[PDB]
Amino acid sequence: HMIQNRAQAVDQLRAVARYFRQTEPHSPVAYLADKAAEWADMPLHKWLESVVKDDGSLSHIRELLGVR
Amino acid sequence: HMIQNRAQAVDQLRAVARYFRQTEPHSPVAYLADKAAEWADMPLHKWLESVVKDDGSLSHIRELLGVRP
Amino acid sequence: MIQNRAQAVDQLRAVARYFRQTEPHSPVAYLADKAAEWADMPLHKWLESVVKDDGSLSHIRELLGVRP
Amino acid sequence: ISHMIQNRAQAVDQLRAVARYFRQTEPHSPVAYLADKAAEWADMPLHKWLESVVKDDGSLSHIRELLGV
Amino acid sequence: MIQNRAQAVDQLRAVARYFRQTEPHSPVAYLADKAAEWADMPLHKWLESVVKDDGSLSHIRELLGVRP
Amino acid sequence: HMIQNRAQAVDQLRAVARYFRQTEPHSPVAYLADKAAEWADMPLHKWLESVVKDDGSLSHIRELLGVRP
């Protein structure tokens, strides 16, 4: 099934997760496909908030982009 | 798009990465879909070596499994 | 020859039963049953019971997208 | 008693079989590791098993005195 | 010859009784009975009454999947 | 089931040890059934040497019995 848009790619990731979740309960692949699915619709600023550890490095990037 | 086996699931992850490289090159999603496809082809004891930070916790795990520390 | 996950679990348990009637001292039975509980235990749960270091667990959880 | 020696061989071989199943179907399953370690343990005499599992040398020596080793 | 584990345990008790009736100062009577107790004692119980260090014991219980 | 004398009781302990040693390599019964047979053929002063830990308590017992190394 040729992927035509972002929401289809998300559906395909979530599906891979379902395959592994019933086929291989230990595969970390499911955990990571499901994370990738959440990331797909996460706006850059939100994504940066959760991924960047240092509050200073984060403030700097918020300044380069202009957020509050 | 009904996943019949392990190969297809990996094939699809890769295809998801290919979609985001062409459509959204700033998407972190391509990186994950690929890390995930590597992880599929990596056995448990190997995956744990790259993921567990503390050496003592990693020796403990190896001991529960039987691997040679 | 073993066909699915459930047969493998019955075999393990059956092996454990065998060693419990014949070698009450063999650790084989204990391990056979430990393995059968692991069979259907998902990765994130298995990691909880095996990783000693709280920090290494927080990290692994973060890589996997698991929430506390 | 040779029928009892062979029944353990047969049990031990089903462990190996389980581990084989899991190694080929669920490469991330820790079950493959334990099932195989269970099979090592089956052909390991008690004092060797105690040597690898009893951490503290005091408790190990005492055990050796109880058993006479 | 000895055919099964109940028959072997009987010899032990039997040996204990012969030594108790013929040589009350013999320590063999005591050890034959200890052996007979041990025969019907599961590994986890046997370890419980043999291992001295709680550290060592709790570690073994973890390896075997036993709850204290 | 008819034990006639000391030597038969010792052969018997030995046979018990061989039965468990051949059938249950993890049973501690063999080790112990064999120590019993060792003890059987050991005189009291030797048995007391291997079993009494404190050298003062042992010297004293040697005095009570009139033994000399």
Numbering used by the authors:
A (entry chain D): 301 to 368
B (entry chain G), F (entry chain A): 301 to 369
C (entry chain C), E (entry chain B): 302 to 369
D (entry chain H): 299 to 367
Reproduce passages from the article.
Contractile bacteriophages of the family Myoviridae (i.e. T4), R-type pyocins and the type VI secretion system (T6SS) of Gram-negative bacteria are evolutionarily related nano-scale injection machines that puncture target cell membranes using a shared contraction mechanism. TssA subunits are enigmatic as they possess a conserved N-terminal region of unknown function, previously identified as ImpA_N (PFAM: PF0681226), whereas sequences located C-terminal to this region are highly divergent. Consistent with this, phylogenetic analysis has suggested that the TssA family can be subdivided into three clades (TssA1, TssA2 and TssA3). The structural studies presented here show that TssA1B, TssA2A and TssA2B possess structurally diverse CTDs that lead to distinct overall architectures for their respective complexes.
The structure of a Bc TssA1B CTD domain construct (I303-S373) was determined to 3.08 Å and the asymmetric unit was observed to contain eight CTD monomers (chains A–H). Each chain folds into four α-helices (α12-α15) that lie in approximately the same plane, and form two antiparallel pairs. The eight monomers in the asymmetric unit further assemble into a higher order oligomer of 32 subunits, consistent with the SEC-MALLS analysis of TssA1B and TssA1B CTD oligomers, with D16 symmetry using the crystallographic two-fold axes to make up a double-layered ring with 16 subunits in each layer. In the assembled Bc TssA1B CTD ring, analysis by PISA32 revealed an extensive dimer interface (~950 Å2) between monomers in the different layers, which principally involves the interaction of residues located in helices α12–α13 with their two-fold related subunits forming a region of hydrophobic packing with hydrophilic interactions at the periphery. Further less extensive interactions (~570 Å2) were identified between dimers that facilitate formation of the ring, with each pair of helices α14-α15 in one dimer, together with a small number of residues from α13, interacting with their equivalents in adjacent 16-fold related dimers on either side. This type of interlocking series of interactions is repeated in a cyclic arrangement to form a double-layered ring. In the crystal structure of the TssA1B CTD oligomer, the double ring is ~25 Å thick with a lumenal diameter of ~110 Å and an outer diameter of ~200 Å, in agreement with the dimensions of Bc TssA1B and purified CTD oligomers determined by negative stain EM analysis. The C-termini of the TssA1B CTD monomers are located at the inner face of the ring, while their N-termini are orientated on the outside, consistent with EM analysis, which places the Nt1 domain at the periphery of the ring in the intact complex. The Bc TssA1B CTD structure shows that this motif defines a loop that connects α12 and α13, and includes a salt bridge between E324 from this motif and a conserved arginine, R306, from a symmetry-related subunit.
